[PDB]
Amino acid sequence: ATTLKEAADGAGRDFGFALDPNRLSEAQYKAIADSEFNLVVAENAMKWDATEPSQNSFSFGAGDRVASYAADTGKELYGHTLVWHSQLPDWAKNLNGSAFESAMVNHVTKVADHFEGKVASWDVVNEAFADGGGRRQDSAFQQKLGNGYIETAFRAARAADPTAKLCINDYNVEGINAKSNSLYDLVKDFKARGVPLDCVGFQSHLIVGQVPGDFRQNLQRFADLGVDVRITELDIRMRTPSDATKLATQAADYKKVVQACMQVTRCQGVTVWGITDKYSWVPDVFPGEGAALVWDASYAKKPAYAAVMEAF
């Protein structure tokens, strides 16, 4: 194996990255995207704010570019994300009751339909739970619609796209904890009542030297509920600047994650949230933290690269 792509290919799994369409005009970026991955997800192009800036007015330009890139290079296409509390336009946050419900169902239907046949799987609902257990405490959907909005989104997504793999996504649920437990209950419930649900996405936004020791176990119990599992937004945050020691630990961590997936027959694969640290979303969100991706700002393979290659 000379690329992470064929390594993942040989393991019968996916290895993807979060794409910023604008960067495709950057040669080195495209070269890596083209050769090191077999799956692609829109880092931002398919979110609510990007697809429905104004009520009932859709903007699929950016999303279509991402979709075209996938079809053009023969990569699987992953959809992110239909229902999410973040990056939600104000016009939506201003709606309530029936109006809001209607706008949510409409958003799901229009976006799902638009990419039908192209997007193979969707993070239908993202980040619905709260660290420590229970539902997220700062979500427009949870506050305006209560517990039933999740099921409604999945049913509406299934209605718009009969065959797409419908997933629920979250972070800090990689290991067994109060958050993953609540997520687990929801999944068990949905499968029990026949609610459309086919997968669970573990964002996996981890911190170096802090990969959950029960990652595999946790992935396995979810898979045993009768749904596929996948690492969808992998990146391992470290205190900057980076140094040999922290880069080595990070490498060991990436190995652990990919290995956990490899040890679960239902783990479809791993998707890293970006290619290079030059564009990683971490620094601006986590002050003093960064250097979380496989390639550095100069597009040089970091120790994590060889670790992933080995894990696969």
Ligand SMILES: O=C1NCC[C@@H](O[C@@H]2OC[C@@H](O)[C@H](O)[C@H]2O)[C@@H]1O
């Ligand atoms: O599921 C998610 N978990 C947190 C990272 C977020 O992506 C982030 O959203 C904010 C954007 O400014 C940023 O470019 C993007 O990387 C993602 O959609």
